[PDB]
Write a protein that binds this DNA or RNA. Structure first.
Ligand SMILES: [Mg+2]
Ligand SMILES: [Mg+2]
Ligand SMILES: [Mg+2]
Ligand SMILES: [Mg+2]
Ligand SMILES: [Mg+2]
Length: 93
RNA sequence: CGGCCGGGAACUCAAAGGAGACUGCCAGUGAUAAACUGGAGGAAGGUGGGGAUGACGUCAAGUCAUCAUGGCCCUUACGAC
């Protein structure tokens, strides 16, 4: 039963959403003082700067393993990076 | 009325050996950086101040009168009193 990658990939493509600007969920893989690694699972676990996750008091409410929601800008950048933005989701909200 | 004189190892000082200051800490900037700026502490803060220390080479630079030395010249003389 060599399940064809064609139909498996079709299943995957209907499983997710790929368009610029789309608000998509993600898993926060790691948190650092500088950037936060998030994963929407497209081509690369992206990294978003820290201030995008800070409140008026400059607090990183977000923790590791939390499911956050960021706006995908481009699925790729020429540098092998998915580009995600939290501030865009903030504007949407 | 003078450390002067008993006296004391407190203090200056005399040298000898050590401690200390390294962006070490904090904040911001910065390119997830090197570094920079500011602040605290500190006697001292960013090489703390100063000195000694002069790479490969250039100027056929200077010195045959410090010295040494290749050559050339004088030897009753350019030597010596
Ligand atoms: Mg200072
Ligand atoms: Mg030196
Ligand atoms: Mg000459
Ligand atoms: Mg000269
Ligand atoms: Mg001359």
């Amino acid at each position: 039963m060599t399940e064809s990658f064609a139909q498996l990939f079709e299943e995957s493509l209907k499983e997710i959403e790929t368009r610029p600007g789309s608000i998509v969920r993600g898993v926060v893989v790691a948190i650092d003082k500088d950037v936060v690694l998030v994963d929407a699972g497209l081509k690369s676990e992206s990294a978003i700067p820290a201030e995008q996750f800070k409140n008026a008091q400059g607090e990183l409410e977000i923790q590791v393993g939390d499911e956050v929601d960021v706006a995908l800008d481009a699925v790729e950048d020429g540098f092998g990076e998915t580009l995600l933005s939290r501030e865009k989701a903030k504007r949407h909200e």
